[PDB]
Each structure stands twice: as C-alpha cells, then as structure tokens.
C-alpha cells in the first residue's frame, strides 16, 4: 500500500526516488509499524503532537535531567517517525538520555544507555524489529565501539553519525565501530555535506543538510549535521523491517546499501562508498 506525502521535507523526497528534486515522499503505508526505535541522545520530547502518542522518553543517565532541554534528541526522533518529518510514520519511539542538556555525556553513561536500550527493548512490543539511533560522537574509545558492537550483536539495528569534522570517521566513536551502520550526510544538490566525515568506516549517506524536524517546545527547527542523516537511516530500516521483515542487524545495513542509489553523489573521496539511501519505492 504505497501512499505519498506532498510537500515533504526534501530529505524524504530524496530517499523515495533515484533522482533528486522531488518534494513528494512515497512509501508503503505499513510505515515501520510493529517496529521499535531507540533514540540515544539528549532525550525526546514525547508530548510533542508530531509523534502522535508513539513516543515516550523512558530513561536517563543524567543526574536530575529527565527531559530533553537541548533539542537534539527530539529533532532526531522527528526524522525517525514524526507524522510530517519522519521516515517510519507508524513506528514507536523510545528516548534514552545519555547526554545532558548542555550536550555532554560521559562514555560510561553512554555505554550504560546502549545496554539499557537493549535490555529494555525486550520488555517492549516490537514484533518486526528494534532499531537504534546514536547521532553523537567524540574521540575514539574502544569501550564505546564495544558497547555499540554489543547492540548489534543483540539484534538491534544500530546506526550512528559519521561525525561533523570533515575528517575520516576512523578516529571517532561510535563511528569507527565496523559493526554499526555509520552514516555520512548529504546535500539536496547531491553533494557530501561540507562537514560530513568520510572513510571506509562510513556505511551509507542520507539527507543531512537543512533538515526540518520536530523541536522542543512543541515546534520544529531546521539544522544540519550527520545527526540529521542518521535518523533517516534508522527510520529507513524500521520501515524496511516492517515491510520486508527484519533480516538481522548488520544485514539491515547491508540491505540498505543494496537499495542505495549509486555514484550519484559528489564530494565523496576515494575509499568512501558512493551510496545514497533509497527506500525501494517501485515507482521511484
């Protein structure tokens, strides 16, 4: 059941079509329903009307901050499954705050958040899959890549942000973990976003510049970053899992790379894949 959503943020039109320019987002109605998506960030503003009751922020590893008072996590949750700005429109969102509101998190608090989401995901109703979003990063830490790797090993499609350093992702975490689906950011004229990290360790590219999404205070905001490209991927996967069935956590990153539009991007250096997300739309 393919429907279409007219006047959709360019990023959604870019993923349901092989050629750029479309403002219509075409997708199957199931829209990642029966699937669960964990947003590991500054938290998610559940009350927001764009989530249609499908978001609940359930855990925090930050002292006395049990709410997204930053904006990052809610912006990312909107791209994953908000009514107007999200990919997987029937998905269920769960927020785990691992970054305080000034936008900072200890690696320890982050590793704990990843495990919490894995352990918690099994107490939730996600018959068609559990996906995860980590639009965060810092210097390379094996401890983090390992906690990240473990999520993958438990069957959770974890996608993480390449980074906004215009550098090779190999030097950051969760970015450098071979096992997670690392995401680079894309421009609407099909160029790698000037800030997007790159390298062999990045597994896919998706809309990352000028992305409109949900924001704290009941609004929307338009920001650019690899954290904007990542929820395009986490959402794309929930959608593919609710439509084609969950194939595995790494296999879902693999499936995404197979569907991806090839050699259409510019700004992509040698050693870096030239893959742009595509949702498999028959009439795409």
């Amino acid at each position: 059941a393919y429907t279409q959503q007219p006047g959709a943020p360019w990023g959604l039109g870019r993923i349901s079509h092989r050629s750029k320019g479309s403002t219509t987002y075409e997708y199957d109605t199931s829209g990642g329903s029966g699937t669960c998506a964990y947003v590991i960030d500054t938290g998610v503003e559940a009350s927001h009307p764009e989530f249609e009751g499908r978001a609940s922020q359930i855990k925090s590893f930050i002292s006395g901050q049990n709410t997204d008072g930053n904006g990052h996590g809610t912006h990312c949750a909107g791209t994953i499954g908000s009514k107007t700005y999200g990919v997987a429109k029937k998905t269920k969102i769960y927020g785990v705050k691992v970054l305080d509101n000034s936008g900072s998190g200890s690696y320890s608090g982050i590793i704990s958040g990843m495990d919490f989401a894995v352990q918690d995901s099994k107490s939730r109703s996600c018959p068609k899959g559990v996906v995860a979003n980590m639009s965060l990063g810092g210097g390379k830490a094996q401890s983090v890549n390992d906690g990240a790797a473990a999520m993958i090993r438990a069957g959770v499609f974890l996608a993480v942000a390449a980074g906004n350093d215009n550098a090779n992702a190999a030097n950051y975490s969760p970015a450098s973990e071979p096992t997670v689906c690392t995401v680079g950011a894309t421009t609407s004229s099909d160029a790698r976003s000037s800030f997007s990290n790159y390298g062999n360790l990045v597994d896919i590219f998706a809309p990352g510049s000028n992305i409109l999404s949900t924001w704290i205070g009941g609004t929307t905001n338009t920001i650019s970053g690899t954290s904007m490209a990542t929820p395009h991927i986490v959402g794309l996967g929930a959608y593919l899992a609710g439509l084609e069935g969950f194939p595995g956590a790494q296999a879902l990153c693999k499936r995404i790379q197979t569907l991806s539009t090839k050699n259409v991007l510019t700004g992509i250096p040698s050693g870096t894949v030239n893959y742009l997300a595509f949702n498999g739309n028959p009439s795409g």
Binding site: D41, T42, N70, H72, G73, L99, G103, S104, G105, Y107, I110, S135, L136, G137, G138, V144, A161, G163, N164, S173, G225, T226, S227
Partner: peptide
C-alpha cells in the same frame, strides 16, 4: 561525546 557531544550531539552532532
């Protein structure tokens, strides 16, 4: 880490 910081959000990106």
């Amino acid at each position: 880490a910081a959000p990106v």
